[PDB]
Amino acid sequence: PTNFTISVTTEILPVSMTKTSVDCTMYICGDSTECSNLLLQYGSFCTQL
């Protein structure tokens, strides 16, 4: 080669996503007392989430 060129290029990368939290009783029962008292003889499927 006898001459050259300067080239500027672009690269795009994800770094992070959104952070969420879920309330187990409010999603399942929803301020019911008949429910959320039946959802107490089920196991620990709400701390593990």
Binding site: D23, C24, T25, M26, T33
Partner: protein, 49 residues
């Protein structure tokens, strides 16, 4: 989670119906109907006691 609020009162709202249902004109009713030509009747505006 939510453990801090408990519902206290309980309210009931029903429409203003006063006359009782005709249980006694469809329950003694000197002559009934044959099974093959059974009788159908509509009931409306009742306090079904």
């Amino acid at each position: 989670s939510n453990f801090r609020v408990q519902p206290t009162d309980s309210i009931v709202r029903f429409p203003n119906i006063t006359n009782l249902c005709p249980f006694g004109e469809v329950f003694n009713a000197t002559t009934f109907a044959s099974v093959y030509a059974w009788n159908r009747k509509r009931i409306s505006n009742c306090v079904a006691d």
